[PDB]
UniProtKB/Swiss-Prot annotation:
This is Potassium channel toxin alpha-KTx 4.2. The lineage of its organism: Eukaryota, Metazoa, Ecdysozoa, Arthropoda, Chelicerata. The keyword Endoplasmic reticulum does not apply. The chain holds residues 23 to 57 of 57 of the full protein. It is found in: Secreted. Has the structural arrangement of an alpha-helix connected to a beta-sheet by disulfide bonds (CSalpha/beta). GO terms for cellular component: extracellular region. Disulfide bonds join 7-28, 13-33, 17-35.
């Protein structure tokens, strides 16, 4: 899901996404995570 874990690069959430659902997914949306 989209989270307020601010981004730098496209991922800048992958790690979280992996530990949240299981895989390094999601992108950089409005400088916030879109997983």
């Amino acid at each position: 899901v989209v989270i307020g874990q601010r981004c730098y690069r496209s991922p800048d959430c992958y790690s979280a996404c992996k530990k949240l659902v299981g895989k390094a997914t999601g992108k950089c949306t409005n400088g916030r995570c879109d997983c």
